[PDB]
Scaffold this active site. Structure first.
Site, PDB file in Angstrom:
ATOM      1  N   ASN A  75       0.271  10.901  -1.867  1.00 43.85           N
ATOM      2  CA  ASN A  75      -0.074  11.748  -0.727  1.00 43.85           C
ATOM      3  C   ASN A  75       0.847  12.960  -0.642  1.00 43.85           C
ATOM      4  OD1 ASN A  75      -1.499   9.143   0.032  1.00 43.85           O
ATOM      5  ND2 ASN A  75      -2.031  10.414   1.801  1.00 43.85           N
TER       6      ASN A  75
ATOM      7  N   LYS B 133       0.816  -1.207   0.000  1.00 46.69           N
ATOM      8  CA  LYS B 133       0.000   0.000   0.000  1.00 46.69           C
ATOM      9  C   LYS B 133       0.854   1.262   0.000  1.00 46.69           C
ATOM     10  CE  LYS B 133      -4.046   2.098   1.098  1.00 46.69           C
ATOM     11  NZ  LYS B 133      -4.613   1.365   2.264  1.00 46.69           N
TER      12      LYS B 133
ATOM     13  N   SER C 115      -5.882  11.980   1.231  1.00 43.98           N
ATOM     14  CA  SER C 115      -6.166  12.427   2.590  1.00 43.98           C
ATOM     15  C   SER C 115      -5.165  13.477   3.053  1.00 43.98           C
ATOM     16  CB  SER C 115      -6.157  11.229   3.540  1.00 43.98           C
ATOM     17  OG  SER C 115      -4.878  10.616   3.562  1.00 43.98           O
TER      18      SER C 115
HETATM   19  N1  LIG Z   1      -7.203   5.032  -0.231  1.00 41.83           N
HETATM   20  C1  LIG Z   1      -6.563   5.321   1.007  1.00 41.83           C
HETATM   21  O1  LIG Z   1      -5.386   5.047   1.163  1.00 41.83           O
HETATM   22  C2  LIG Z   1      -7.346   5.969   2.127  1.00 41.83           C
HETATM   23  C3  LIG Z   1      -6.809   5.855   3.511  1.00 41.83           C
HETATM   24  N2  LIG Z   1      -7.039   6.832   4.523  1.00 41.83           N
HETATM   25  C4  LIG Z   1      -6.341   6.694   5.834  1.00 41.83           C
HETATM   26  O2  LIG Z   1      -7.409   6.407   6.993  1.00 41.83           O
HETATM   27  C5  LIG Z   1      -7.020   7.025   8.067  1.00 41.83           C
HETATM   28  C6  LIG Z   1      -8.118   8.112   8.471  1.00 41.83           C
HETATM   29  O3  LIG Z   1      -8.313   8.903   7.266  1.00 41.83           O
HETATM   30  P1  LIG Z   1      -9.549   9.975   7.123  1.00 41.83           P
HETATM   31  O4  LIG Z   1     -10.826   9.346   7.555  1.00 41.83           O
HETATM   32  O5  LIG Z   1      -9.638  10.385   5.709  1.00 41.83           O
HETATM   33  O6  LIG Z   1      -9.195  11.311   8.067  1.00 41.83           O
HETATM   34  P2  LIG Z   1     -10.340  12.300   8.724  1.00 41.83           P
HETATM   35  O7  LIG Z   1      -9.689  13.544   9.246  1.00 41.83           O
HETATM   36  O8  LIG Z   1     -11.345  12.641   7.698  1.00 41.83           O
HETATM   37  O9  LIG Z   1     -11.054  11.469   9.981  1.00 41.83           O
HETATM   38  C7  LIG Z   1     -10.284  11.180  11.116  1.00 41.83           C
HETATM   39  C8  LIG Z   1     -11.242  11.178  12.302  1.00 41.83           C
HETATM   40  O10 LIG Z   1     -10.652  10.740  13.377  1.00 41.83           O
HETATM   41  C9  LIG Z   1     -11.170  11.683  14.550  1.00 41.83           C
HETATM   42  N3  LIG Z   1     -10.253  11.646  15.664  1.00 41.83           N
HETATM   43  C10 LIG Z   1      -8.937  11.714  15.894  1.00 41.83           C
HETATM   44  N4  LIG Z   1      -8.734  11.622  17.214  1.00 41.83           N
HETATM   45  C11 LIG Z   1      -9.936  11.501  17.806  1.00 41.83           C
HETATM   46  C12 LIG Z   1     -10.289  11.376  19.130  1.00 41.83           C
HETATM   47  N5  LIG Z   1      -9.555  11.328  20.386  1.00 41.83           N
HETATM   48  N6  LIG Z   1     -11.570  11.270  19.474  1.00 41.83           N
HETATM   49  C13 LIG Z   1     -12.524  11.283  18.514  1.00 41.83           C
HETATM   50  N7  LIG Z   1     -12.177  11.407  17.207  1.00 41.83           N
HETATM   51  C14 LIG Z   1     -10.878  11.516  16.855  1.00 41.83           C
HETATM   52  C15 LIG Z   1     -11.139  12.893  13.996  1.00 41.83           C
HETATM   53  O11 LIG Z   1     -12.037  13.851  14.727  1.00 41.83           O
HETATM   54  P3  LIG Z   1     -11.968  15.466  14.305  1.00 41.83           P
HETATM   55  O12 LIG Z   1     -12.735  15.697  13.055  1.00 41.83           O
HETATM   56  O13 LIG Z   1     -12.577  16.274  15.440  1.00 41.83           O
HETATM   57  O14 LIG Z   1     -10.558  15.885  14.111  1.00 41.83           O
HETATM   58  C16 LIG Z   1     -11.648  12.653  12.602  1.00 41.83           C
HETATM   59  O15 LIG Z   1     -13.022  12.791  12.555  1.00 41.83           O
HETATM   60  C17 LIG Z   1      -5.713   7.740   7.691  1.00 41.83           C
HETATM   61  O16 LIG Z   1      -4.624   6.991   8.151  1.00 41.83           O
HETATM   62  C18 LIG Z   1      -5.725   7.794   6.172  1.00 41.83           C
HETATM   63  O17 LIG Z   1      -4.302   7.853   5.614  1.00 41.83           O
HETATM   64  C19 LIG Z   1      -7.949   7.937   4.281  1.00 41.83           C
HETATM   65  C20 LIG Z   1      -8.724   8.048   2.937  1.00 41.83           C
HETATM   66  C21 LIG Z   1      -8.379   7.097   1.750  1.00 41.83           C
END
Ligand SMILES: NC(=O)C1=CN([C@@H]2O[C@H](COP(=O)(O)OP(=O)(O)OC[C@H]3O[C@@H](n4cnc5c(N)ncnc54)[C@H](OP(=O)(O)O)[C@@H]3O)[C@@H](O)[C@H]2O)C=CC1
Ligand SMILES: NC(=O)C1=CN([C@@H]2O[C@H](COP(=O)(O)OP(=O)(O)OC[C@H]3O[C@@H](n4cnc5c(N)ncnc54)[C@H](OP(=O)(O)O)[C@@H]3O)[C@@H](O)[C@H]2O)C=CC1
Lengths: 310, 310
Positions: A200, A192, A262
């Site tokens: 990225n 990956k 992301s």
């Molecule tokens: N094709 C690919 O490779 C894909 C992989 N990914 C990966 O997935 C993972 C997450 O990505 P993504 O969803 O897009 O990122 P986002 O920012 O969209 O979502 C992350 C979430 O985690 C929450 N978060 C972090 N800490 C806490 C905490 N203590 N309590 C509650 N919520 C928390 C954040 O809340 P808050 O909003 O308040 O900050 C946020 O809502 C990453 O590692 C990313 O690299 C992502 C998209 C595509």
């Protein structure tokens, strides 16, 4: 019916929790900044694959201590917060729960393991999906969605580990998603990295989505060169990846819709970049194996410089 | 008293023509976009080395055909326009005139030679100077100013070539500038690439002047790595550069005031970048010699991508 907890309800956590909930599972969402809008208006999904979906009301929580004990915990936070995330996972975990990291990078599970009880199963979920958050409570899903699961650590022997990986894959399969049991989670994570390392960082460095990066011959050649460094580094660390993997991955990205990685959204919003898991960790593994990745090394340096500038 | 023509009166051409004019030489300036303001108000210099200088009135021309025959022609245009510049040089050249390219890059003289009569002496002038254009007709000189001259081609034998290089150096020495006769112009151009290759491109790529690039440890390490690629490429092409040249050059850049390279101004103003002479030419020489420069190759690709984006 497994009881599912989503720890970090962003684009990834929202999508997979919603998909699982839509399939009849009892899903409980831990939210942070967007808790108020989702607790109130719910979660909605625009998807070119699955059409529109909406979950309302949502079983929403602003504190992990309020969550009931969950059998499967889907971690959708970015890897930057994993140390601070561990007490939240521990609180929401039923005895013998399965912790599944829907996170990019290398060494993610290993760095979290010291903070999880050895009685919990710790797995990696590699998600091949084009998704991002839209307005609060709205998930924008452009393509794909499959999850490849692998087992890192926990109380299971090899036979049991394969059974548990298959149990996870079945959860996603029952929800209408592609899912694959992986025999080797580290190998899958190296695989990956071949996509995430060039796309990225370069999307931030060159402020560009995937389609212009593929349509310009200089960035396309640069992406391919970076891929060969990641492929070569994986081999040097003992993880041979398939013949012609770069050409295949480049072809799939041509077929892909115009997508902002992301990391692009993170820099746009002033959020810290996942440099440690996506760049620092494989660079360290490469140096230990005596294999240099000059383009990746330089990209990581450029991204670190960019994060420090006003 | 030599009659001097300046072909391209920008930051470099303005500075050196003004310096020479201030020393009693008969200097004639060919201007383009800024001809009206300079023909009218003259040329002025803010310099932390030489203090304020002003030349008014200026012997200004908008067409090379109007210029009288000149004994020395100082070419201060960017290298991007050199093909279109040749008819202008030929017109302003007295018989047996000396053409001196105050230009960065590699292979500059060689690519211009087919467009100059073999009866003209063609020399390179490597200028180590922090200078840029301010308001129209105003030259902003922050530091240094020295010119190292080397002979490329023309009707002179070796003895005569050294004499002519010394004649040029004396012109600048008489004007209060540091000047050095170089025995090997190509070697000198490779040496100068060690600075211009990292700093010019990275200042555009990371939108940063020299001081932040040196103060951040990641960009500083990246600059040093790029320098070693240029040093290694020069050696591979048969031009050994001194021991510890990178450490020396990095030290001098620390001592340097905060400076925006010429390429930074070009991208800020939508002017084409000098990629062909500074990146494409040494990359081609390196590939011919079997030496790869992965960081420089990638920087050139990134800069080409940036120039193509809307
Ligand atoms: N094709 C690919 O490779 C894909 C992989 N990914 C990966 O997935 C993972 C997450 O990505 P993504 O969803 O897009 O990122 P986002 O920012 O969209 O979502 C992350 C979430 O985690 C929450 N978060 C972090 N800490 C806490 C905490 N203590 N309590 C509650 N919520 C928390 C954040 O809340 P808050 O909003 O308040 O900050 C946020 O809502 C990453 O590692 C990313 O690299 C992502 C998209 C595509
Ligand atoms: N320490 C170092 O390494 C330094 C080296 N340099 C190098 O010197 C060279 C010139 O740099 P610089 O002076 O800063 O660039 P500038 O843009 O400031 O000046 C270039 C001048 O050439 C003029 N020009 C181009 N074509 C013509 C033409 N047909 N007729 C008349 N004028 C023309 C331009 O006119 P117009 O304004 O209308 O476009 C412009 O005024 C470059 O190769 C650069 O890399 C530059 C600064 C520091």
């Amino acid at each position: 019916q497994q009881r599912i907890g989503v720890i970090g309800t962003g684009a990834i956590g929202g999508f997979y929790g919603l998909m699982l909930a839509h399939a009849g599972h009892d899903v409980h969402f831990l939210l942070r900044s967007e808790f108020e809008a989702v607790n109130r208006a719910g979660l909605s999904l625009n998807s070119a694959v699955h059409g529109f979906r909406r979950l309302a009301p949502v079983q929403a929580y602003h504190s992990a201590q309020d969550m009931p004990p969950c059998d499967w915990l889907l971690v959708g936070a970015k890897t930057t917060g994993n140390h601070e995330l561990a007490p939240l996972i521990r609180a929401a975990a039923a005895p013998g729960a399965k912790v599944l990291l829907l996170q990019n990078g290398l060494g993610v599970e290993e760095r979290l393991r010291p903070l999880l009880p050895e009685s919990l199963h710790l797995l990696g979920g590699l998600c091949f999906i084009c998704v991002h958050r839209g307005e609060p409570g709205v998930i924008e899903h452009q393509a794909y969605g499959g999850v490849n699961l692998g087992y890192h650590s926990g109380p299971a022997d090899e036979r049991r580990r394969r059974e548990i990986v298959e149990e996870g894959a079945a959860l996603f399969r029952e929800s209408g998603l592609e899912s694959t049991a992986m025999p080797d989670l580290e190998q899958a994570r190296w695989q990956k990295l071949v996509w995430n390392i060039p796309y990225n960082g370069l999307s931030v460095l060159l402020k560009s989505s995937t389609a212009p990066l593929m349509a310009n011959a200089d960035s396309r050649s640069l992406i391919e060169a970076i891929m060969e460094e990641v492929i070569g580094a994986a081999g040097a660390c003992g993880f041979i990846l398939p013949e012609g993997y770069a050409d295949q991955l480049l072809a799939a990205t041509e077929r892909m819709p115009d997508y902002r990685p992301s990391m692009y959204h993170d820099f746009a919003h002033g959020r810290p970049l996942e440099l440690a898991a996506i760049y620092a960790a494989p660079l360290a593994r490469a140096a230990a194996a005596g294999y240099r990745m000059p383009r990746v090394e330089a990209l990581h340096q450029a991204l670190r410089f960019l994060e420090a500038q006003p």
